[PDB]
Curated annotation (Swiss-Prot), chains B, H:
It comes from Saccharomyces cerevisiae (strain ATCC 204508 / S288c) (Baker's yeast). It holds the Pfam family Proteasome. The modification Phosphoserine is found at residue 76. This is Proteasome subunit beta type-4. The modification N-acetylmethionine is found at residue 1. GO terms for biological process: proteasomal ubiquitin-independent protein catabolic process; proteasome-mediated ubiquitin-dependent protein catabolic process. Belongs to the peptidase T1B family. Non-catalytic component of the proteasome which degrades poly-ubiquitinated proteins in the cytoplasm and in the nucleus. It is essential for the regulated turnover of proteins and for the removal of misfolded proteins. The proteasome is a multicatalytic proteinase complex that is characterized by its ability to cleave peptides with Arg, Phe, Tyr, Leu, and Glu adjacent to the leaving group at neutral or slightly basic pH. It has an ATP-dependent proteolytic activity. This subunit has a chymotrypsin-like activity. Keywords: Acetylation, Cytoplasm, Nucleus, Phosphoprotein, Proteasome. SUPFAM superfamilies: N-terminal nucleophile aminohydrolases (Ntn hydrolases).
Swiss-Prot record, chain C:
Signal peptide: none annotated. Belongs to the peptidase T1B family. The keyword Nucleus applies. Non-catalytic component of the proteasome which degrades poly-ubiquitinated proteins in the cytoplasm and in the nucleus. It is essential for the regulated turnover of proteins and for the removal of misfolded proteins. The proteasome is a multicatalytic proteinase complex that is characterized by its ability to cleave peptides with Arg, Phe, Tyr, Leu, and Glu adjacent to the leaving group at neutral or slightly basic pH. It has an ATP-dependent proteolytic activity. PRE3 and PRE4 are necessary for the peptidyl-glutamyl-peptide-hydrolyzing activity. The gene is PRE4. The 26S proteasome consists of a 20S proteasome core and two 19S regulatory subunits. The 20S proteasome core is composed of 28 subunits that are arranged in four stacked rings, resulting in a barrel-shaped structure. The two end rings are each formed by seven alpha subunits, and the two central rings are each formed by seven beta subunits. The catalytic chamber with the active sites is on the inside of the barrel. Interacts with CIC1. It holds the Pfam family Proteasome. Present with 16900 molecules/cell in log phase SD medium. SUPFAM superfamilies: N-terminal nucleophile aminohydrolases (Ntn hydrolases) (SSF56235). It comes from Saccharomyces cerevisiae (strain ATCC 204508 / S288c) (Baker's yeast).
Swiss-Prot record, chains D, I:
The active site is at 1 (nucleophile). The side chain of Thr-1 acts as a nucleophile, and the N-terminal amino group acts as a proton acceptor. Present with 7250 molecules/cell in log phase SD medium. Belongs to the peptidase T1B family. It is found in: Cytoplasm; Nucleus. Signal peptide: none annotated. This is Proteasome subunit beta type-1. It holds the Pfam family Proteasome. Keywords: Acetylation, Cytoplasm, Hydrolase, Nucleus, Protease, Proteasome, Threonine protease, Zymogen. It comes from Saccharomyces cerevisiae (strain ATCC 204508 / S288c) (Baker's yeast). GO terms for molecular function: endopeptidase activity; threonine-type endopeptidase activity. CDD domains: proteasome_beta_type_6.
Swiss-Prot record, chain G:
It catalyses: Cleavage of peptide bonds with very broad specificity. It comes from Saccharomyces cerevisiae (strain ATCC 204508 / S288c) (Baker's yeast). Transmembrane segments: none annotated. One of its GO terms (molecular function) is endopeptidase activity. Belongs to the peptidase T1B family. The active site is at residue 1. This is Proteasome subunit beta type-5. The keyword Protein transport does not apply. GO terms for biological process: proteasomal ubiquitin-independent protein catabolic process; proteasome core complex assembly; proteasome-mediated ubiquitin-dependent protein catabolic process. The side chain of Thr-1 acts as a nucleophile, and the N-terminal amino group acts as a proton acceptor. The gene is PRE2. GO terms for cellular component: cytosol; nucleus; peroxisome; proteasome complex; proteasome core complex, beta-subunit complex. It comes from the Eukaryota.
């Protein structure tokens, strides 16, 4: 019954030479019943991306909570928030609710408009932070991802090769996870230009 | 649980909702209307826990109506369902949560497009071409996966929906005492009192 | 099912170039009470094996009986009963493990952890665990109770792999095992201060040391600890 | 574990082991279970850890705020501030606590605040999981008013057996003598009490 | 309350090649958060060119195997030292396992070898007897970390022929025992990186029409 | 989780591995249990991750506010009184056990607070999954007065005993040395005994393997 | 699991998926959910993986003794009875298994008997057991007709399992088909649900809400 | 539970028994016959636990038939029901009891009188003019208390029984998928396949 | 409650109170917890009532059937027949049982069969809810081999405190001396042991 597995889903992020990639499946279902295949888990505030897994009603609320928050930030500092300055936020945020947590597993990922360096980060429900130079995974097929990433990952891939590696990890774990699938979408984030793509996968 | 179906077609939404009401061993009624119109072009069906069910429905209805005379403008399907998911969202983490699942189907006179939102008591919202709450889905979802097309006429949808009910009857243990159908579109809401008068 | 009443703690052991070691204090706890001392947990069998037992004492006393009778029995119509055809460690252990399992499989176990150490008739070292569930496994080092948590670590800084036994002097092996026994007594409310260490060298034979104790301790640095943060006197 | 405080000729002496277990593991084997809340007022902690620790912290606080305006406090006083906390909160506290102090007038007295905040003043008291064994000795070998040494070799033999049969208690003995002279610290290593 | 079961971690793996078969399994043996031995085999030759491994609760494993091997022994005794056809073997293992349907062996067992035509062959088992002829099966603690990988690699899943869009699936060719062992080794290392119950060593038994071969490779002792 | 701390002549040193668990799966392969309360005051956190990193956070911030206002360097018992006063208020529902260490204008200090608010002191402390491992490497090789290099060598040789013999701890060692009249030195990775060997195959796919359905260029600003 | 079988002019049509799952992970997508009792009878597999496989294979041996003794083909009813009887003996012990015994003898024509560990033994025309049974029943209920061709009878069973496969998370993989005749059963291959979907969507128009 | 009705009239007994069979969520059948003829003029309906239900019925039937060829004489309704209550009686105190409730309605060619015995799984037997098992009684018993008369024709009984069913439909939550009726008399058993074909 | 048997110069002496509680009520206040299974072989019952009672009944039986054919049995023998029953049945028995006997050769020995049928031969043993208090005395005041009187004033002072702090134990002391001389019965009323 674990609140973090009613709805299902997965998210994964990777870093490459001057870019990052963030990907997720599309399914939202109740227990075994599949309800939707257009449920996206990746949002963005300015040039900062956040993917969220877990209890759907919380995933939605958090997006709204962060949109709200980031808009107020921009207005006050006269600039969009950065990836690190943002991670710190969603961490404190998650924690202010330490004794009635939102049941999620966020994952930030972006590029710093000043330095120009790639960034990816993960957190657990109460907000513990976690940077990594290679990859972040979260979700129901969490283990299947660690297995794929700890094989297919390669430092400094070119954005065109990163797209292939990340896709393949997502694609294959979602096939060994009974509650993740029904489509996927992947993003390739550079300093400028952001390309979004939907992939073709088994619909079972 | 109760029956709650809904399907969006070419230019309108259709809502099906079983008529029976049961308290334990008996059936106190076989002509209950689980619907409740929020505004001229937004309709919302519901099903859930005994008391929670309509206390909530009316509450929502009251807020929308208030907003509508105040602004003298009509709130849109999209924004209406958004408000609902907000409430239910806060509800789940309160001394005692409403256990209510819903379907909202309105006509966006601004885009001239029908829209149907399905929301469960946890605050989980999603826009769909057709939906259902509770066990209602397992018996129908496959038939609709099969025949549904976005170009369908209101006239065609009903015929479809009829099939789903016929299936619900043949394989469902509970006797839901039939359904009541309602249509939402550019001209407002009307009741197909002829799926019952048939 | 059942519950253990009287109980012996750890039993640490290791291998070296010519043989194996195995120690275990002599206290037999009765819960928080330490109602016993003249308790021997090192049961040698024949002239080439020794079995260190841990856990329920009533069940240890039961095995011992079984072992004695296994001996008084191998002789029955067997003239080489002390030479060519005489109980090996591997025979004893195989037999023991059998029983242990047979038992859990009848939901009526013997609450014990066991070590069978010795040297085969052809000279090889033998060290194998076997607890009340039937689970067994070999290794350079072995220990019951805390041994698995506090002994092992040290007895590994010595023989880190299967490629170090050959270069481990019977003397270095022991000097460690005893410092380990110092540690065990340092942090384990269910342990006694004096013990019984037994060696099984392929050349020298079986050496059964008895009643010793742990010397060379450090409690002086206590005088310096006062209170818990604020107290200055 | 094993704690106690004994009254005698000059005033009183309170001592107790160093062992503090968490399961059958020894978290610390050299603990100072003799907290001082004031110059001539000390106490030996028993029961839970974290709780007793914080009580003292508070009890101290008050006294330190007392003298500061009502002059140096008695000993009967301190044992009150102690129960007040141990009573009102008997629901979320596990404290053994023994209080002892030397007052110029009244000589030196001993009060024992057990589970429940039930206060008692006795010649001497003994609490701690290990006290269950020294009920034979302690009672049968106790003469009213001893000497500074005639007694230190009591606390020593009591605390001897306490360690000998109660696993949850051991380490090194620790005494604190509250007298007209003042505070004195003692410590009698293993190879010693076992010797007996 | 006496609980008769225990989990000694471990992971085993069995791939069936075109004309050979493998069955690997790390050597670490654990209990809760501790180590019981960095080298304790869980993969044995049972005779008649058949490798077997039962992974889960150490003891039930040893028992089944012993019980199986004593069974091969008697199959010969009663049918003129006739060879045990690996298929005939799995059917037999079923009965052994189902024998204890109401006090089950708490283990996932796997055999592997050659059929009666010389082709490789693997067999995965339920902990109560349900068996199926598998061609590639990871079972154990980290099976959920190696199956997604082999899926992709050994069976080329989710891979398509470039420049044909999602229209042509990349064709499967069959791996030389050499390539398979490179696959098998990478899988186990990854697993050790992300799973605390996997590490120390990896022992592999290869079945071919000459007998059984064994190879070892050290893993990290995390 | 496997941390220790030991003081010498002119200061104190603490070390901690870098491996966060989460069931048997590894999450962070290079974490950081060492936090800064104030320049010369550091903590080592075992147990519930978020809790320790969030509590040190707090206390730190407040002490910074304290010194500023009082115009004096942060004492170490303050940081202690703060932590255990807070830890207690929450009857242990904020599982953060840790080792606080530092140096103030009154000497060098070392403490260990448990979850419920209990605190103890000694010259060497161990907290975590492998506390019994690195506490056999401390009740053996310990002596009063130890060179800076000795203290450092011991602390890092304790952690190591945790890495290898415990499953709930591994990867690298992290160290921080606080010396009197001197600044503090943070040694992120004073050791790196574990380093995955190189793979056996390159797993990069040829461009166009994955099948796409739609593509497009999303916007950002206004 | 989604298994089904039904009667019609051509005889019986049996269809199953192949997914087996442990908790939320797919331990296998290659399960033979059809037990080939013998040349003339097939049993399906729901409930317990082993209980189904074991006893049904046992049942096959039984039919063989019976046929050697009477020098005649055992009847579907007698076979189904034997099974359920053995099952009933262990009522309480914790067995688990929903199943379709399918045969077509000379005298009784084409017969399906649902049988489960409760001791239930039902005769029928259409049966669906599983976690996807509800979805399979949909496509099936609306399209079944006693006069189905053979070609279409198989396609119906296939599209049915597919429907489940898609919606029920615990169902999927590849569909396996069999057709049972008065001379025995014929295997009609193993079709991967992955590939079949795209095919049907494209050639039937159905599955609109799926972008691909 | 299932539906089991029965009523004795002037010179015959009538038995009603719902047709559906349900396993959890679905309805595997809507044409099940809960009846089982023990002899030319004794009929017995049943309803209870899944497996126990017909294993028992057949067992009973086998004993009666055996007795009948052996003696070449037909056992009487009274003695038949007595035997049943005996078995069920022993059953309740055995490793595992059959959970089956029953109705036996035969024609005593010796007295030329119809008789109906109602027995529950505990071994509780009673002779009645009309009966029912499980929840089936609360919805009907009052209607029958009202209209039943011992002089009633077979023809009148059916009309009565029809009313009871119509009530069962209107107020019972479960959809039992109709009933199957059967008549026992001096000429034996026949099925009113026209309450279904109506 | 409070039972024990001590070995000395001639042979051994085993004694124990009379109190037997059922809740906080005293069912009998003059119980003979010193059962004799044979001339020179006696034992003092502890633990459950009804169980221990029946064990003895049996143990006796065997011995009586032993001598009858294998001559008078040793003491080590009797303690075996005792554990045999206490082991095989550790599931439905609660027995404290202490066995003591005087053999011409071996002098007089003492074995203690505790919960679990774990047998032990010691200089002397003490079992019963009240033994928990006389672990101080008993151990610290024990010299090897005493006199017939030099010891009777031990059992008397042990059993003194046992009663003094353990409610579940009291009544009148009861001793039985097994010697070359034979069996002798003693009884030392309340106004006496309290006096000390």
């Amino acid at each position: 019954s674990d609140p973090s597995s009613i709805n299902g889903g997965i998210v994964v992020a990777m870093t490459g030479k001057d870019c990052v990639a963030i990907a997720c499946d599309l399914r939202l279902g109740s227990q075994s019943l599949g309800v939707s295949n257009k449920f996206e888990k990746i949002f963005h505030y300015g040039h900062v991306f956040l993917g969220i897994t877990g209890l759907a009603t919380d995933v939605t609320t958090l997006n709204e909570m962060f949109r709200y928050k980031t808009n107020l930030y921009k207005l006050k500092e006269e600039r969009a928030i950065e990836p690190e300055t943002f991670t710190q936020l969603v961490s404190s945020s998650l924690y202010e609710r330490r004794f009635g947590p939102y049941f999620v597993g966020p994952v930030v990922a972006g590029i710093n408009s000043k330095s120009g360096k790639p960034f990816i980060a993960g957190f657990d429900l109460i907000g513990c932070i976690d940077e990594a130079k290679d990859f972040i995974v979260s979700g129901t097929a969490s283990d299947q991802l660690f297995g794929m990433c700890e094989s297919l990952y390669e430092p400094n891939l070119e954005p065109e090769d990163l797209f292939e590696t990340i896709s393949q990890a997502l694609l294959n774990a979602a096939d060994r996870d009974a509650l993740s699938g029904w489509g996927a979408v992947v993003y390739i984030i550079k300093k400028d230009e952001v390309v979004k793509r939907y992939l073709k996968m088994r619909q079972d | 649980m109760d029956i709650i179906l809904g399907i969006r077609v070419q230019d309108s939404v259709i809502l099906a909702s079983s008529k029976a009401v049961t308290r334990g061993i008996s059936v106190l009624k076989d002509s209950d209307d689980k619907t409740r119109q929020l505004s001229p072009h937004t309709l919302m069906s519901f099903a859930g826990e005994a008391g929670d069910t309509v206390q909530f429905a009316e509450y929502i209805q009251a807020n929308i109506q208030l907003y509508s005379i105040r602004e003298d403008y009509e709130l849109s399907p999209q924004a209406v369902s958004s408000f609902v998911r907000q409430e239910l969202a806060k509800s789940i983490r309160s001394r005692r949560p409403y256990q209510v699942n819903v379907l909202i189907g309105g006509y966006d006179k601004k885009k001239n497009k029908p829209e149907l939102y399905q929301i469960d008591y946890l605050g989980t919202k999603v826009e769909l071409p057709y939906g259902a709450h509770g066990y209602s889905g397992f018996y129908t979802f496959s038939l609709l996966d099969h025949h549904y097309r976005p170009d369908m006429t209101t006239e065609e949808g009903l015929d479809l929906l009829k099939l789903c009910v016929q299936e619900l009857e043949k394989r469902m243990p509970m006797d839901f005492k039939g359904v009541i159908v309602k249509i939402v579109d550019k001209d407002g809401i009307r009741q197909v009192d002829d799926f019952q008068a048939q | 099912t059942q519950q253990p009443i009287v109980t012996g703690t750890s039993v640490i052991s290791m291998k070296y170039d010519n043989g194996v070691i195995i120690a275990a204090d002599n206290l037999g706890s009765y819960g928080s009470l330490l109602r016993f001392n003249g308790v021997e947990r090192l049961i040698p069998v024949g002239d080439n094996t020794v079995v260190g037992i841990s856990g329920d004492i009533s069940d240890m006393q039961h095995i011992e009986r079984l072992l004695k009778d296994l001996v008084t029995e191998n002789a029955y119509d067997n003239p080489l009963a002390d030479a060519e055809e005489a109980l090996e460690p591997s025979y004893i252990f195989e037999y023991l493990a059998t029983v242990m399992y047979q038992r859990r499989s009848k939901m009526n176990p013997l609450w014990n952890a066991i070590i069978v150490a010795g040297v085969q008739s052809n000279g090889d070292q033998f060290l194998r665990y076997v607890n009340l569930l039937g689970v067994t496994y070999s290794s350079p080092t072995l220990a019951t109770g805390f041994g698995a948590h506090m002994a092992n670590p040290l007895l590994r800084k010595v023989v880190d792999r299967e490629s170090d036994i050959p270069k481990t002097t019977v003397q270095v092996a022991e000097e460690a095992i005893v410092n380990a026994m110092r540690v065990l007594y340092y942090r384990d409310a269910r342990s006694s201060r004096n013990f019984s260490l037994a060696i099984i060298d392929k050349n020298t034979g079986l050496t059964f040391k008895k009643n010793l104790q742990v010397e060379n301790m450090k409690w002086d640095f206590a005088k310096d600890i006062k209170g818990y943060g604020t107290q200055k006197i | 574990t094993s704690i106690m405080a004994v009254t005698f000729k000059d005033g009183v002496i309170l001592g107790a082991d160093s062992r503090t277990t968490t399961g059958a593991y020894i978290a610390n084997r050299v603990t100072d279970k003799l907290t001082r809340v004031h110059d001539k007022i000390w106490c030996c902690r028993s029961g839970s850890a974290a709780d007793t620790q914080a009580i003292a912290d508070i009890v101290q606080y008050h006294l330190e705020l007392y003298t500061s305006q009502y002059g140096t406090p008695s000993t009967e006083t301190a044992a009150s501030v102690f129960k007040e906390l141990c009573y009102e909160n008997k629901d979320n506290l596990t404290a053994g606590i023994i209080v002892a102090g030397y007052d110029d007038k009244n000589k030196g007295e001993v009060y024992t605040i057990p589970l429940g905040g039930s206060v008692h003043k006795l010649p001497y008291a003994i609490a701690g999981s290990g006290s269950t064994f020294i009920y034979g000795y302690c009672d049968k070998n106790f003469r009213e008013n001893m000497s500074k040494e005639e007694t230190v070799d009591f606390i020593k033999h009591s605390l001897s057996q306490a360690i000998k049969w109660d696993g949850s208690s051991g380490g090194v003995i620790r005494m604190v003598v509250l007298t007209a002279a003042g505070v004195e610290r003692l410590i009698f290593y293993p190879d010693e009490y076992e010797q007996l | 309350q006496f609980n008769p079961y225990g989990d000694n971690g471990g992971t085993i793996l069995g791939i069936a090649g075109e004309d050979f078969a493998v069955l690997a399994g790390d050597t670490r043996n654990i209990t809760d958060y501790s180590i019981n031995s960095r080298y304790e085999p869980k993969v044995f030759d049972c005779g008649d060119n058949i490798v077997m491994s039962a992974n889960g609760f150490a003891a039930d494993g040893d028992a089944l195997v012993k019980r199986f091997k004593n069974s091969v022994k008697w199959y010969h005794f009663d049918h003129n030292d006739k060879k045990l056809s690996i298929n005939s073997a799995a059917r037999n293992i079923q009965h052994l396992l189902y024998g204890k349907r109401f006090f089950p062996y708490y283990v996932h067992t796997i055999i592997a070898g050659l059929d009666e035509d010389g082709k490789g062959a693997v067999y995965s088992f339920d902990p109560v007897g349900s068996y199926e002829r598998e061609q590639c099966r990871a079972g154990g603690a980290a099976a959920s970390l190696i199956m997604p990988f082999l899926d992709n690699q050994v069976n080329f899943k989710n891979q398509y022929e470039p420049g044909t869009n999602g229209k042509v699936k990349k064709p499967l060719k069959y791996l030389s025992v050499e390539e398979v062992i490179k696959l098998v080794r990478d899988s186990f290392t990854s697993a050790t990186e992300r799973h605390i119950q996997v590490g120390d060593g990896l022992e592999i038994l290869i079945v071919t029409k000459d007998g059984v071969r064994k190879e070892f490779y050290e893993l990290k002792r995390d | 989780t496997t941390i220790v701390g030991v003081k010498f002549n002119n200061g104190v040193v603490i070390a901690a591995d870098t491996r966060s668990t989460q069931g048997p799966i590894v999450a962070d392969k290079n974490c950081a249990k060492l936090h800064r309360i104030s320049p010369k005051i550091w903590c080592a956190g075992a147990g519930t991750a978020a809790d320790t990193e969030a509590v040190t956070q707090l206390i730190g911030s407040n002490i910074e506010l304290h010194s500023l206002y009082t115009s004096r360097e942060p004492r170490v018992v303050s940081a202690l009184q703060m932590l255990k006063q807070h830890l207690f208020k929450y009857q242990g529902h904020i599982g953060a056990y840790l080792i606080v260490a530092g140096v103030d204008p009154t000497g060098s200090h070392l403490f260990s607070i448990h979850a419920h608010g209990s605190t103890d002191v000694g010259y060497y402390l161990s907290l975590g999954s492998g506390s019994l491992a690195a506490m056999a490497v401390l009740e053996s090789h310990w002596k009063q007065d130890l060179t800076k290099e000795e203290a450092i060598k011991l602390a890092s040789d304790a952690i190591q005993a945790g890495i290898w013999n415990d499953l709930g701890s591994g990867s690298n060692v992290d160290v921080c040395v606080m010396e009197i009249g001197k600044d503090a030195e943070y040694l992120r990775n004073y050791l790196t005994p574990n380093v995955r060997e190189e793979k056996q195959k390159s797993y990069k796919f040829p461009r166009g393997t994955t099948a796409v359905l739609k593509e497009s260029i999303v916007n950002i600003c206004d | 699991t989604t298994t089904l079988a039904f009667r019609f002019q051509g005889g019986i049509i049996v269809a199953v998926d192949s997914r087996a799952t442990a908790g939320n992970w797919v331990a296998s997508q290659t399960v033979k959910r059809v037990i080939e009792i013998n040349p003339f009878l097939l049993g399906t597999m729901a409930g317990g993986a082993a209980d189904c496989q074991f006893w049904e294979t046992w049942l096959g041996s039984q039919c063989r003794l019976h046929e050697l003794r009477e020098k005649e083909r055992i009847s579907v009813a007698a076979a189904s009875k034997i099974l359920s009887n053995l099952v009933y003996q262990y009522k309480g012990a914790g067995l688990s298994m929903g199943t379709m015994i399918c045969g077509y003898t000379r005298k009784e024509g084409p017969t399906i008997y649902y049988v489960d560990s409760d001791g239930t033994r039902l005769k029928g025309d259409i049966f669906c057991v599983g976690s996807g049974q509800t979805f399979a029943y949909g496509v099936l209920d609306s399209n079944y007709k006693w006069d189905l061709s053979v070609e279409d009878a198989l396609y119906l069973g296939k599209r049915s399992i597919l429907a489940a496969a898609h919606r029920d998370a615990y169902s999927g993989g590849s569909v396996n088909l069999y057709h049972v005749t008065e001379d025995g059963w014929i295997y009609h291959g193993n079709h991967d649900v992955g590939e079949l979907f795209w095919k049907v969507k494209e050639e039937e128009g159905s599955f609109n809400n799926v972008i691909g």
